[PDB]
Paper text:
In these experiments, bacterial proteins with different functions were investigated. Microcrystals of photoactive yellow protein (PYP), a blue-light photoreceptor from Halorhodospira halophila, were used to explore the capability of microsecond X-ray pulses. A nitrite-reducing enzyme, cytochrome c nitrite reductase (ccNiR) from Shewanella oneidensis, was exploited to investigate potential secondary radiation damage, caused by 90 µs pulses, at heme centers. Finally, a first TR-SSX experiment was performed on the photosensory core module (PCM) of a bacterial phytochrome from the nonphotosynthetic myxobacterium Stigmatella aurantiaca.
Residue numbers in the entry:
A (entry chain B), B (entry chain A): 32 to 470
Amino acid sequence: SDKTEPRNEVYKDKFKNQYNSWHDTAKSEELVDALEQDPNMVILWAGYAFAKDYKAPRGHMYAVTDVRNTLRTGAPKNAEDGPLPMACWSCKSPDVPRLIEEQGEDGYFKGKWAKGGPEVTNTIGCSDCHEKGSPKLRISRPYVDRALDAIGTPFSKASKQDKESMVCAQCHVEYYFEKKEDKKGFVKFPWDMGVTVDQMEVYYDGIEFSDWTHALSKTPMLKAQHPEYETWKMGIHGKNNVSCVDCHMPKVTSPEGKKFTDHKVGNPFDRFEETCATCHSQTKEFLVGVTNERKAKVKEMKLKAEEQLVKAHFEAAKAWELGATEAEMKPILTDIRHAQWRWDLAIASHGVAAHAPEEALRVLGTSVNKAADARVKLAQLLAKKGLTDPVAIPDISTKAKAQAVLGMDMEKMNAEKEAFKKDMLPKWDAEAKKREATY
Amino acid sequence: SDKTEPRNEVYKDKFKNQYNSWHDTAKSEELVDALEQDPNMVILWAGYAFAKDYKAPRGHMYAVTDVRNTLRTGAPKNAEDGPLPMACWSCKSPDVPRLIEEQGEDGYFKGKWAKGGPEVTNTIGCSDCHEKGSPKLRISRPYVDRALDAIGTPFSKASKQDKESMVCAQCHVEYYFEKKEDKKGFVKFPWDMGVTVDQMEVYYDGIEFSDWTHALSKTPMLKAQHPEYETWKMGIHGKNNVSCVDCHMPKVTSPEGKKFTDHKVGNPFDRFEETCATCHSQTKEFLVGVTNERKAKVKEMKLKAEEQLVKAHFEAAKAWELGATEAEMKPILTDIRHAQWRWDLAIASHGVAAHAPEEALRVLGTSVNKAADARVKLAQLLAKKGLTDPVAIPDISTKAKAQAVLGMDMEKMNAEKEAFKKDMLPKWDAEAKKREATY
Ligand code: HEC
Ligand code: HEC
Ligand code: HEC
Ligand code: HEC
Ligand code: HEC
Ligand code: HEC
Ligand code: HEC
Ligand code: HEC
Ligand code: HEC
Ligand code: HEC
Ligand SMILES: [Ca+2]
Ligand SMILES: [Ca+2]
């Protein structure tokens, strides 16, 4: 393109060190089946693509295999097969700013996932955060800019230290999918109101948005996704503009002598003597062991906010199954909507504990003061509908008992996924070999 | 007798720095009626001491003025009288070690409150932290050094920072008088498990202790009384050995030029240098935004905890009035005791917004999660009992409107105290100067 290059090896030389640390984002390769880890989420996302494959994020060289080989996109056969629209790339490849340059936005967006599938082939790449070649940094998706001009802080008109955290937040944020036909599958950041879990919840609620309808309690359920920049602005780090780069891209020196920026983006503790060493008088073993303590006072309340949530869908699933009305089930599924939305947001980023854990726990607190306002109103209605006992909760100890409790054909899913893994995928990588070897 | 000195005023001249600062705790008379400002404590401390009178904690020259006055203490007619016992003078004056060091603890706590009326007069001061004349921090109390010996850190160990925060730890702690016949009336701190909210729970339980049986929900209630050390131990500076002295007793520089520790104990922002300045490099008002944002996240979740509890107490007098057996209301009532305990600890130290906020929020979170399990249990139960429309809560909007909901004659509580504040108090102040003549 005029503006965007996606072939990531053109810069292996002429940016020698900065390239090979960007390859060290293949130094973190581990499927973390967080559906087998916390099988109480199979049951809370009861009726979404998440009941099928949630994983902790791994390296940055895997953004393209993973967005393919996750059970959340199935075995498509045609260029509209597959449930999820195109825009499920967006945050995986410089083959996204490339194709927003070449067809406006709309030409990228409208269309199912696999249609543009043989066109995204590079992993997360250089011209994503940077200009073409140039050492400068750009925003290479136009919604991200449109989204800043809603919170207050335009890219070019905001300090270098501001920008340090930005280009991290073209991707790592929370997003819906614009339901109008003129925006048929755009990405868009729900900031507009603000970014407290309270301000977002009030936004979506104006536009009665639903990512799905809870296939257990029939609640208009919201799905929080990677709220990184959005929680980072609440932690006393980001209260003083500790950049996203200041920790996850630590400006190191070469064996030889000159300073670059390490482009491996892993755990800032792999480069402690380099990241959080530089702004502190502490030791590691002290600071790491204190982050592993926050990483568990967030863990415990994450669970005793789910146990009231499972115990509520089923305390609502019964409420349906005695025939309650819409009129009756209104302000219950209002509460369950909110109570689970707060639970998702507070811990939909795997580092709210590191980044802003004070706000983690207040959110998780109001995700229970709501679930309460539900399970009270769900048992008072189970009374005036003739139940006075409490509802049972079947064996959801494994992922495979909780997945199978939903009548899911998790076999026909796996069957076709590693079928299409070894059937279409050879083509997408080959048909793109064709064109993208001609520049 | 030898090691104490009740008049800290006898050293006014060898230390005018250490005494004219010490004396400025009296430049602090903001008395806020924390029941005029939350009628939902009234209901939560229903049938207990602080149903009558809770106040702000003002400066130290008032503790023997405040504890002579807080309607909790009541109106003894002689000194075989009084609602409360000895161990209330424990933390309110220097006359206190002068009593254990004349006869021992047996001889102290075995008594009524107004038994030792005109024996404790001089308000808080020197020999409560010091060796008579010596500018050194001894532990004036013995129940302290026995609890400190039960957490593995007696006073001898104590790197000079540990020490520093231990002499605040004799009075700024969570305490219970003991019930058992042989250690009867003695103060005891519940650290045997111990320091944390969860660790004082296993203790206060396994041993079957109960500050009072609630008058609405007929719960065996628990009081949580101003724990600073324990919350402070969990806060970030706690984990960095940043003694209570740094923030509240900075080293203010003399008018002559000396550099003496400030003995006016109060605010770290009525001294933003010497305090926060020696560590954190931001403006006085940036670091004041935080501790207030952090203060009113707790205020939101604290109130959204009393939110449930106040309901669940009335949700329990009905289920009693609708006639329940003891055997029904059993686990429902232990949850209540577990809710309004974790809540009360989370928010008893008039500034845990500042010390560990993250821990008050997790603790405040567990409260609402534990009140939540109770109300469903109360919901199903009141349902089998002919109640299905939700339990109604009456106007409890002011102190004096909620105080008169629990039936309380504040005139025959104010009248009996406007005589005790007029008669039997300059009658103690009389024999004060008499017993203080023999010095
Ligand atoms: C040693 C363990 C401490 C004791 C005992 C107390 N604190 Fe603190 N302190 C600090 C701040 C920033 C505040 C904010 C005051 C407010 O806005 O309410 C406080 C306040 C208190 C209070 C309440 C104040 C009042 O009643 O007006 C009490 C009872 C109290 N402190 C006791 C700062 C710090 C600090 C700096 C890191 C430390 C180590 C402590 N406080 C520790 C103690
Ligand atoms: C810019 C807003 C970012 C982004 C996009 C991320 N961070 Fe952080 N983070 C820091 C530390 C010490 C951890 C602990 C890691 C662990 O315990 O495993 C994290 C956590 C993350 C993760 C999860 C790691 C993983 O493998 O998933 C991610 C994806 C992440 N962060 C992205 C340190 C900091 C930090 C200091 C508190 C700041 C500021 C940032 N990171 C900023 C960002
Ligand atoms: C930018 C706004 C993104 C869009 C649009 C989509 N994803 Fe993403 N993805 C993004 C981030 C910041 C991360 C890592 C953080 C995390 O908490 O996971 C990911 C990761 C994934 C993964 C791997 C983990 C997993 O869930 O298995 C998958 C499979 C994935 N993303 C799929 C996916 C789909 C189906 C999308 C369309 C809804 C999609 N992503 C959009 C950033 C962004
Ligand atoms: C987004 C996740 C990035 C990817 C992928 C790559 N880089 Fe990058 N790089 C990124 C940022 C936000 C910065 C900070 C620059 C600054 O000083 O503000 C950098 C650093 C650079 C620079 C300039 C400064 C430096 O430290 O070297 C250049 C010229 C650079 N990186 C080049 C580069 C190339 C060629 C990459 C593909 C191999 C690459 N980076 C990966 C963000 C991201
Ligand atoms: C869109 C191209 C992204 C941009 C720009 C940034 N990140 Fe991201 N990241 C993205 C995805 C889709 C994933 C999923 C990983 C997977 O394969 O499932 C990730 C992952 C991370 C991780 C985890 C890395 C690890 O070793 O586990 C981190 C720490 C991370 N991302 C941080 C991060 C930072 C700090 C960024 C600004 C430089 C950044 N990312 C940009 C997508 C995208
Ligand atoms: C300079 C750019 C910093 C780096 C690198 C890290 N932190 Fe930090 N931290 C910084 C500031 C300005 C503050 C505010 C306190 C102050 O002294 O002004 C902090 C505060 C913390 C906290 C407490 C609050 C929280 O968000 O949990 C922690 C736990 C903390 N810092 C830890 C930490 C660690 C382990 C780091 C390396 C990964 C780290 N910080 C980086 C500035 C900077
Ligand atoms: C028991 C003898 C105490 C010891 C030891 C310390 N304090 Fe105290 N403090 C005590 C009482 C009974 C009160 C309230 C008095 C009243 O009239 O209501 C206080 C008050 C404070 C305050 C608030 C003072 C103000 O100006 O508002 C603070 C900030 C405080 N206490 C802190 C503190 C510290 C850090 C101590 C150890 C150095 C300490 N106190 C000792 C009782 C006792
Ligand atoms: C030392 C372990 C104490 C004992 C025993 C008692 N209290 Fe005290 N009190 C103490 C502190 C550290 C504070 C400040 C925190 C707060 O919540 O205010 C207080 C506060 C008071 C006050 C001021 C207003 C009020 O809280 O009602 C009074 C009047 C008071 N305390 C009196 C009092 C009584 C009657 C006690 C026996 C039940 C008692 N205190 C116990 C420290 C300690
Ligand atoms: C506990 C609440 C205290 C009471 C009561 C009094 N002071 Fe104190 N003293 C206190 C602290 C925290 C320290 C710090 C020791 C250090 O190393 O900094 C001290 C020390 C002193 C000193 C030493 C001089 C100095 O370094 O400031 C003196 C002369 C002293 N204390 C005298 C003193 C007097 C006369 C008091 C009654 C008017 C008094 N102290 C009360 C804490 C406490
Ligand atoms: C040196 C003795 C300190 C004084 C005086 C104060 N603080 Fe502190 N602070 C100190 C340390 C060693 C740390 C750990 C992280 C770091 O590397 O600096 C902190 C951290 C904070 C935090 C964040 C965590 C929290 O408990 O909320 C805040 C908000 C903070 N510091 C502010 C603060 C204020 C307002 C102070 C005056 C009362 C203050 N600190 C005193 C060290 C020291
Ligand atoms: Ca969304
Ligand atoms: Ca108690």
